[PDB]
Amino acid sequence: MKASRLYTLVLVLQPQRVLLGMKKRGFGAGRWNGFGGKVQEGETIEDGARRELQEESGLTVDALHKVGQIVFEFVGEPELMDVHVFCTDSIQGTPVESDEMRPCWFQLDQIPFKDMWPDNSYWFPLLLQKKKFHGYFKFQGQDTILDYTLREVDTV
């Protein structure tokens, strides 16, 4: 197969709203996304998710809940992105804007799907229903899905 690199993604989901971060600079600026990044050597995936949430947004949490796993493949990139998806509802601190990311709350009837990664339209709804999932999405560039699979699972 291909090799994969481990990433995290954290959705701060409360009963009526979700916190997302807008990419401010670089390629892909303007898109809203959960918080996360590459897992580092030595840490568990969950601890890496907590670390990235704090580094990116300022927020801390005692614990996260794992809700999904999604593999992303990009045309022209040999390495797969293996993204472990977590959900907070409980959080310490206020979110902080950085030079790279602007955080913003959205009501759950105003989820900004058109300005999110296209895959989020498929798996976000499961997350809102408190379901767990496994997914795979192959992209041409940033906007076009060529193939995907999505399945609800009982155990992630």
- State in angstroms the smallest separation of the CB of 155 from ligand 6U4: 21
Residue placing its CB nearer to ligand 6U4 in the complex, 17 or 136: 136
Q: Which does 119 bind (CB under 5 to 8 A by kind): Na ion, ligand 6U4, none?
A: ligand 6U4
Residue placing its CB nearer to ligand 6U4 in the complex, 17 or 31: 31
Tell me which residue has tokens 């992105």. Answer: 81
- State in angstroms the smallest separation of the CB of 130 from ligand 6U4: 18
- State in angstroms the smallest separation of the CB of 109 from Na ion: 27
Binding footprint of ligand 6U4 on the chain (CB under 6 A): 7-9, 33-34, 36-38, 72, 83, 117, 119-120
Chain breaks in the chain (C to N over 2.5 A) after: none
Q: Which does 5 bind (CB under 5 to 8 A by kind): Na ion, ligand 6U4, none?
A: none
Q: Strand runs (DSSP E) across the chain, as ranges?
A: 4-13, 17-23, 32-33, 65-74, 80-87, 101-107, 132-140, 144-153
Binding footprint of Na ion on the chain (CB under 5 A): 37-38
- State in angstroms the smallest separation of the CB of 35 from ligand 6U4: 7
- The one-letter code for the residue type at 70 is I
Q: Which does 72 bind (CB under 5 to 8 A by kind): Na ion, ligand 6U4, none?
A: ligand 6U4
Local structure of residue 116 (DSSP, 8 states): B
CA distance 146 to 148: 7
Tell me which residue has tokens 């979110």. Answer: 95
Tell which phi-psi region holds residue 57, choosing left (phi > 0), alpha (psi between -120 and 50) or beta: alpha
Q: Which does 122 bind (CB under 5 to 8 A by kind): ligand 6U4, Na ion, none?
A: none
